[PDB]
Amino acid sequence: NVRATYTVIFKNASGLPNGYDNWGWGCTLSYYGGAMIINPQEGKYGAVSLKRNSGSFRGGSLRFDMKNEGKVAILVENSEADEKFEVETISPSDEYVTYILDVDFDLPFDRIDFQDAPGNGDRIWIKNLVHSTGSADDFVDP
């Protein structure tokens, strides 16, 4: 079977996704309108860090809808190795945009981070977060 595995982490969020803890820092999270809303603290470069409690992801791509007042760094991490990887930094947008990003990290990852890169407290809204084991080019949106 050469088709990808698509993991819908959350569609509309009314809390953390079942199977995930938050190992984030320097922010508060709220949930409204199906969005996970990150409110980072000024000067903390805060982030949500969704930690898959059991198991890991490998390579593939990350898909999500986001709007954001400031630049957002997308990272993944391997908690066993304590190794992080910067996937992309996304510029501000006042409207939701769908991103599909290749993850070229070559260790498995069990943490997915959305970070307030400028450290200015700019808010971030996320919906419809999905991992695919396949490439962004080959992604068909579940």
Ligand X SMILES: OC[C@H]1O[C@@H](O[C@H]2[C@H](O)[C@@H](O)[C@H](O[C@H]3[C@H](O)[C@@H](O)[C@H](O[C@H]4[C@H](O)[C@@H](O)[C@H](O[C@H]5[C@H](O)[C@@H](O)[C@H](O[C@H]6[C@H](O)[C@@H](O)[C@@H](O)O[C@@H]6CO)O[C@@H]5CO)O[C@@H]4CO)O[C@@H]3CO)O[C@@H]2CO)[C@H](O)[C@@H](O)[C@@H]1O
Return residues touching ligand X (CB under 6 A).
Answer: 23, 25, 45, 49, 75, 77, 82, 84, 115, 117-119
Specify the residue, 86 or 138, whose C-beta has the smaller distance to ligand X: 86
Minimum CB distance to ligand X, residue 1 (Å): 34
Please, what sign has the CA dihedral across residues 90, 96, 102, 106? positive
Give residue 57's Cα distance to chain centre: 13
For ligand X, the closer CB: 65 or 110: 110
Smallest distance from the beta carbon of 112 to ligand X, in angstroms? 12
Between CA 48 and CA 28 the distance in angstroms is 9
Q: How far apart are CA 12 and CA 64, in angstroms?
A: 11
Q: How far is the CB of 40 from ligand X (least distance, A)?
A: 11
Cα separations in angstroms, 141 against 14, 60, 61, 128, 138:
21, 14, 11, 10, 10
CB closer to ligand X, 7 vs 49: 49
Q: 60's torsion region: left (phi>0), alpha (psi -120 to 50) or beta?
A: left
| Least gap, CB of 50 to ligand X (angstroms) | 12
Which CB, 129 or 132, lies closer to ligand X? 129
